[PDB]
Ligand binder design. Structure first.
Ligand SMILES: CCCCCCC/C=C\CCCCCC(=O)OC[C@@H](O)CO
Ligand SMILES: CCCCCCC/C=C\CCCCCC(=O)OC[C@@H](O)CO
Ligand SMILES: CCCCCCC/C=C\CCCCCC(=O)OC[C@@H](O)CO
Ligand SMILES: CCCCCCC/C=C\CCCCCC(=O)OC[C@@H](O)CO
Ligand SMILES: CCCCCCC/C=C\CCCCCC(=O)OC[C@H](O)CO
Ligand SMILES: CCCCCCC/C=C\CCCCCC(=O)OC[C@H](O)CO
Ligand SMILES: N[C@@H](Cc1ccccc1)C(=O)O
Length: 429
């Protein structure tokens, strides 16, 4: 009695992440459109460029938060309660958007989700490994099934939430995301008791008595330093929303710069790929709503194409690895990400940017970037959240450059630059 050949505990962790990814991507599939709506009603006083910049820096902070989440669970609270309380905060984040608020609830929702995802995301993957004794062949297979559940929830979420939004408005749609996380917590709590090791109800590497004080000093200096900057920024007048976004961008990018100051192309190639891939929920989401002949279905459903192609490619790629150079899998994967943007430059160049084009352009675009991602994933998970975070931090600046007038050039330059650097890697490798 197994779960696809794996310990039964995988089933609990499978579903738990599926429903968290459901709540997360269901929210993101309509959040940008929700901000557009708040702007159009005059409730939210920002530009569409800023709203899209917020989408990118949001994702950046979510993964940056995931970089330290493992530490807090391993040393302080425990992996199991970290997942639970992380899920609680996430559920609360979606509840906030379900309340009859407008722009006033956005910041609170963002913070709750960032902190919550930071506790849950790295620790649920940690718990997956705990199912396996140290040297097991099943381990690789078990994680792969786990990734499938992640993309499963990411697939059905834009379909369900997006349709719900179209029918019953935004607040109801955000509530379904909250319900999704609630389902995950239910399964996780009761399913976890049956299987999961009681060992991870407590931290596995608890702080030694002499470790507490220097840790306290470290976090206090950082918070004080971060507070000092914000204070200084306000005195000089750099206190607009884009000014804060810039600060977060600088912070997110400074961290790896310093980490290395204390693999470089491999990390850069990862950052650039994730930047392109993460723009599917921002730039491609904008393009879908403005340039696509899609009047017979919710435009938010385009967000399902990314996890759809992942689920479609994985059985094929499972062959390739058994059918027959780690840096080269980054070199080519980045070229495919660049080709996906080059493809998007075509309909605007051929038909102009004023009208509407086929949805098949987006399908082809995602088909290429996911093809790139298939090479990326097989090639320190805290660093995995880091390259992802910087890529999104880069997006927070680049994404603002995108509009109907600049569409063709935007896709062309970043499409070409990505391919070139993929070839630059070919020469270096
Ligand atoms: C919210 C929906 C789930 C039902 C929970 C009911 C109990 C209320 C509060 C319990 C909080 C304690 C946290 C439990 C925990 O660390 O999670 C471990 C899980 O694997 C099983 O214990
Ligand atoms: C290890 C991490 C430490 C690195 C932190 C470095 C931060 C130093 C300075 C950041 C403040 C500048 C960002 C704010 C800003 O310029 O806003 C833009 C403003 O011109 C918009 O009108
Ligand atoms: C690997 C080869 C696959 C085929 C791809 C070749 C096509 C790539 C780019 C061609 C774009 C043509 C679209 C029309 C165009 O650019 O004309 C614009 C300009 O002449 C009019 O103002
Ligand atoms: C691994 C798969 C690679 C994907 C290749 C990229 C696909 C190339 C072109 C896709 C869309 C072509 C247009 C189809 C169409 O029906 O045109 C209608 C018209 O409205 C065009 O805008
Ligand atoms: C590298 C990221 C650090 C961020 C963590 C945020 C938490 C800040 C302070 C929490 C530390 C307090 C925990 C101390 C503790 O419970 O252990 C002391 C006992 O001697 C051991 O059980
Ligand atoms: C085999 C995979 C897909 C192949 C993708 C190849 C596409 C490469 C470039 C496409 C777009 C070329 C640029 C067009 C351009 O800048 O013209 C300007 C427009 O006339 C208006 O700005
Ligand atoms: N699509 C990925 C996003 C991600 C990238 C990198 C690290 C962590 C998460 C997921 O849901 O898991």
């Amino acid at each position: 009695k197994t779960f696809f050949g794996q310990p039964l505990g995988l089933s609990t962790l499978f579903m738990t992440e599926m429903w968290e990814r459901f709540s997360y991507y269901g929210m993101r599939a309509i959040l940008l459109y929700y901000m557009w709506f708040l702007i159009s009603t005059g409730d939210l006083h920002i530009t569409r460029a800023t709203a899209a910049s917020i989408m990118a820096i949001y994702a950046s902070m979510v993964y940056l938060s995931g970089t330290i989440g493992g530490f807090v669970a391993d040393r302080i609270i425990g992996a199991r309660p970290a997942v639970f309380w992380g899920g609680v905060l996430i559920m609360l984040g979606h509840i906030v958007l379900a309340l009859p608020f407008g722009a006033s609830a956005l910041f609170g929702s963002i913070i709750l989700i960032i902190i919550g995802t930071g506790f849950l995301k790295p620790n649920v993957s940690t718990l997956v490994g705990t199912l396996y004794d140290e040297h097991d062949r099943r381990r690789d297979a078990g994680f792969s099934i786990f990734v499938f559940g992640i993309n499963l929830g990411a697939f059905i979420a834009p379909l369900i939430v997006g349709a719900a939004q179209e029918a019953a408005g935004y607040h109801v749609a955000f509530s379904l995301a909250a319900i999704g996380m609630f389902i995950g917590l239910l399964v996780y709590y009761f399913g976890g008791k049956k299987t999961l090791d009681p060992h991870y109800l407590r931290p596995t590497d608890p702080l030694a008595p002499e470790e507490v004080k220097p840790l306290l000093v470290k976090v206090s200096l950082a918070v004080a330093g971060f507070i000092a900057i914000i204070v200084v920024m306000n005195l000089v007048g750099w206190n607009s929303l884009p000014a804060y976004i810039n600060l977060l961008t600088i912070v997110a990018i400074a961290i790896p710069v310093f980490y290395f100051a204390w693999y470089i192309p491999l990390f850069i190639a990862a950052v650039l790929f994730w930047a392109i891939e993460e723009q599917g929920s921002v730039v491609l989401a904008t393009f879908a709503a403005e340039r696509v002949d899609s009047s017979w279905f919710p435009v938010s459903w385009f967000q399902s194409l990314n996890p759809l192609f992942i689920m479609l490619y994985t059985p094929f790629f499972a062959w390739l690895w058994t059918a027959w150079s780690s840096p080269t899998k980054f070199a080519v994967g980045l070229m495919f990400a660049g080709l996906s943007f080059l493809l998007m430059a075509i309909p605007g160049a051929l038909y102009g940017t004023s009208g509407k084009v086929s949805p098949l352009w987006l399908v082809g675009s995602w088909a290429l970037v996911i093809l790139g991602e298939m090479l990326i994933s097989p090639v320190m998970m805290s660093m995995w959240f880091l390259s992802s975070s910087v890529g999104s931090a880069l997006n927070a600046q680049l994404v603002t450059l995108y509009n109907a007038k600049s569409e063709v050039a935007y896709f062309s330059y970043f499409g070409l630059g990505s391919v070139v650097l993929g070839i630059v890697l070919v020469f270096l490798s």
